[PDB]
Amino acid sequence: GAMAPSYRVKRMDIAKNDEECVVNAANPRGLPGDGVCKAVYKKWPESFKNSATPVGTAKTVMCGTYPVIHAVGPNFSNYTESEGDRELAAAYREVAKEVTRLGVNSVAIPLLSTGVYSGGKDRLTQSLNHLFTAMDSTDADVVIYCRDKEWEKKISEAIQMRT
Ligand SMILES: [Cl-]
Ligand SMILES: [Cl-]
Ligand SMILES: [Cl-]
């Protein structure tokens, strides 16, 4: 575990992370996809061997010795708000299990279901709160990656609020 487990936020490409493993915002079929998933495919393509997994689950595939945790959030275009909320919570619980099993001291993680799976809604608070519910009992350093300047400020605020 980390000596003083922390949360941090960085605004940059998660393919350039400085952590011991990465969480991919994957699709259920293990396809290259777009956004975070396409960046992850360009950096760690070997990790997409047999990466297909259902909504609400995470499946880890090694790229060399570097673990890529494929976490499948719901597409809110297809799920009801209620069922989507349950699947998004479940995907993060499976990420916490994998991070624990791998014995890493740090993990790079995007906000699941906030991009093309958001069904056109701002889900920063919803996705971040499910991330915290899952990861708070882990002792890995968690570094959250985003691309938007206003999202960076809001995520940083939410982390600092609890400190
Ligand atoms: Cl960048
Ligand atoms: Cl997304
Ligand atoms: Cl973002």
UniProtKB/Swiss-Prot annotation:
Entry binding sites for ADP-D-ribose: D13, N27, G35, G115, V116, Y117
Localization per record: Host cytoplasmic vesicle membrane
Taxonomic superkingdom: Viruses
Effect of N27 to R/Y: Almost complete loss of mono-ADP-ribosylhydrolase activity
Domain Macro per the UniProt entry, residue ranges: 4-163
Membrane topology term: Peripheral membrane protein
Annotated effect of mutating Y117 to V/W: Almost complete loss of mono-ADP-ribosylhydrolase activity
Free-text description of this protein's post-translational modifications in UniProt: Phosphorylated by host on serines and threonines.
Reported impact of V36 to E/F: Almost complete loss of mono-ADP-ribosylhydrolase activity
Description of its domains: In the N-terminus, the macro domain displays a mono-ADP-ribosylhydrolase activity. The central part called, the alphavirus unique domain (AUD) has a zinc-binding function. The C-terminus region, also called hypervariable domain (HVD), is mainly disordered and binds several host proteins. This intrinsically disordered domain contains 2 SH3 domain-binding sites and 2 FGDF motifs necessary and sufficient for the formation of nsP3/G3BP complexes.
Role according to the record: Seems to be essential for minus-strand RNAs and subgenomic 26S mRNAs synthesis. Displays mono-ADP-ribosylhydrolase activity. ADP-ribosylation is a post-translational modification that controls various processes of the host cell and the virus probably needs to revert it for optimal viral replication. Binds proteins of G3BP family and sequesters them into the viral RNA replication complexes thereby inhibiting the formation of host stress granules on viral mRNAs.
Known partners and oligomeric status: Interacts with mRNA-capping enzyme nsP1. Interacts (via C-terminus) with host G3BP1; this interaction inhibits the formation of host stress granules on viral mRNAs and the nsp3-G3BP1 complexes bind viral RNAs and probably orchestrate the assembly of viral replication complexes. Interacts (via C-terminus) with host G3BP2; this interaction inhibits the formation of host stress granules on viral mRNAs and the nsp3-G3BP2 complexes bind viral RNAs and probably orchestrate the assembly of viral replication complexes. Interacts (via C-terminus) with host NAP1L1.
Name of the protein in its database record: Non-structural protein 3
Organism this protein belongs to: Chikungunya virus (strain S27-African prototype)
Parent-protein residues present: 1334 to 1493 of 2474
